[PDB]
Amino acid sequence: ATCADGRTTANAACCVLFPILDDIQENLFDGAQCGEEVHESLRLTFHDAIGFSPTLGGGGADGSIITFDTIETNFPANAGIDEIVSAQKPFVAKHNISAGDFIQFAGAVGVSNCPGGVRIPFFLGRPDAVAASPDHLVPEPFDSVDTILARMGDAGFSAVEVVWLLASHSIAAADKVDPSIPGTPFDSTPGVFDSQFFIETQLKGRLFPGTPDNKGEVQSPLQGEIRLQSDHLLARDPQTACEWQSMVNNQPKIQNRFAGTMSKMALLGQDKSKLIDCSDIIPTPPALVGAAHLPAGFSLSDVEQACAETPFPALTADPGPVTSVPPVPG
Ligand code: HEM
Ligand SMILES: [Ca+2]
Ligand SMILES: [Ca+2]
C-alpha cells in the first residue's frame, strides 16, 4: 500500500504511523538516539501494561497511565514516570492514535534506535483507556524474587520471560533509586542493547555509586553503575539464575526473546485478533557495537556463579585499569 506521505507499508491502515514516527524521532528522541527519552519511554511501556491482573483487574496496555495520570502518577512505583508522561502527552494530543497505541509504538521505535536492538512487533487499534489501573501492580526493586515472579506470573509471564524482559535494563538508568546520582545506568553500555547487563549484575558488588542505604539498591561492581536489589537477586535465584546466565554473550537470544516477550507485554489486556499488525513500520536497528566482555580489570573470579547446571562462560576483559561508567546525559 502507498501512504499519504509517499511511503509504502503492507496494511494501509498503518500509514497513520509514519508521521508519528517522524515526529517522535525528531522531537521526543532527539534525532533517533538511544538516550534518556528512549529509556524512559521503554519503562513506560511496562508501567502501563503491567497494570493487568485477572483477579485485581486493570486494562493492561491501554494508555491508562497517561489518560488517568492524575490517579496513576500517585502510585509508589511510578516515581519519576511523570516526566515521560508529561513529554508524551502533547504527542498523544496531536496525533491520531490511542494513548495505549502511542506508548507501545514509542517504546518499539525507541528500542529500534539502539545499536544491537531488535524490531518489536507492533499492533494498532487499542481502545482508549476506560479506567485507571489498580494500584500496587507494578513490581518494586525491594520486592523478593518470589513476589516479583508471582506478580509477573499473575499478569501472564513465566520466570524465563521475566529474565527476557529485563534485557530492557541493558538500555536503562535510575533517577530515583539513588536520587543523589540521577542518570546512573544499570550496565556500562546504556546506549547499546547488549548482554553487559546480564554480565555485570553477576559480578560481586564492591561499592555504592552514591549514597548508602537506598531502598531497592545493593552494592554495584563499578563506579557510575547502580544495581537494583531485585536484579541482584534475580541473577542469583535458582528460579532465574541459569536463564539469566544463558543470555550472556547470546545476542540473538536476547533480541528474539525480548521482541517476543515485549509483544506479549504490549498486548496485555488486549486481543491481537482485534488489532492490526503494523510491525513493518518499526525501523531497522543499528548493528551491535562492541562484544561481550568483563569490565576492564575484572576476571572470572569476580563473577558470582549461580547457575547450578552450567558454568559461567569464559569472557575476555576489556584492556586497561578499572574505570567508571559515565551517566546518561539529560
Ligand atoms: C521485573 C521487575 C522490574 C523491576 C523491579 C524494575 C525496576 C526498575 C527501577 C527501580 C528502575 C529505576 C527507576 C528510577 O529510579 O528512575 C527501572 C528502570 C527501567 N526499567 Fe525496570 N524493572 C523491572 C522490569 C522492567 C521491565 C519488564 C521493563 C521493560 C520495558 C523495564 C524497563 C526499564 C527501563 C527501560 C528503565 C530505565 C528508565 C530510565 O532510564 O529512566 N523494567 N526499573
Ligand atoms: Ca495501563
Ligand atoms: Ca547495555
Author numbering: 2 to 331
Please quote the paper that reports this structure.
The heterologous expression of the POD genes from the P. ostreatus genome, and subsequent kinetic studies, reveal a peroxidase array consisting of three VPs and six MnPs. The VP1 and MnP4 crystal structures were solved as representative for the two POD families present in the P. ostreatus genome. The overall structure of VP1 and MnP4 showed a heme group dividing the protein into a distal largely helical domain (formed by four main helices and two to three small ones) with one structural calcium ion, and a proximal domain composed by another six helices and a non-ordered region stabilized by a second calcium ion. The site where this takes place is conserved and comprises three acidic residues (E36/E40/D175 in VP1 and E36/E40/D181 in MnP4) located near the heme propionate occupying the most internal position with respect to the main access channel.
The resulting inventory revealed the absence of lignin peroxidases (LiPs) and the presence of three versatile peroxidases (VPs) and six manganese peroxidases (MnPs), the crystal structures of two of them (VP1 and MnP4) were solved at 1.0 to 1.1 Å showing significant structural differences. As already described for P. eryngii VPL, the main structural feature of the P. ostreatus VP1 crystal structure is the combination of the Mn oxidation site of MnPs and the high redox potential substrate oxidation site of LiPs. In addition to the Mn2+ oxidation site, VPs also present a lignin oxidation site, whose presence was detected using VA and RB5 as substrates. This site in VP1 would consist of W164, connected to the heme group via a long-range electron transfer (LRET). The indolic side chain of W164 in VP1 is largely exposed (center) allowing the collection of electrons from the bulky lignin molecule. In a similar way, the W164S mutation in VP1 resulted in a complete loss of activity on VA and RB5 (used as two simple lignin model compounds). The last change in this region concerns S180 in VP1, which is occupied by K186 in MnP4, thus affecting both the surface shape and charge. The lower lip in VP1 presents a clear negative charge and the shape of a wide reservoir, while in MnP4 it displays a less charged surface with a narrow groove (circles in Figure 5C). However, one of the main characteristics of the VP1 structure, when compared with MnP4, is the broader main heme access channel (whose lower lip has the shape of a wide reservoir), which could be related to the reported existence of a third substrate oxidation site in VP. VP1 is the most stable POD retaining over 80% activity after 10 minutes up to 60°C, followed by MnP4, VP3, MnP1, and VP2 (although the VP2 stability sharply decreased with incubation time).
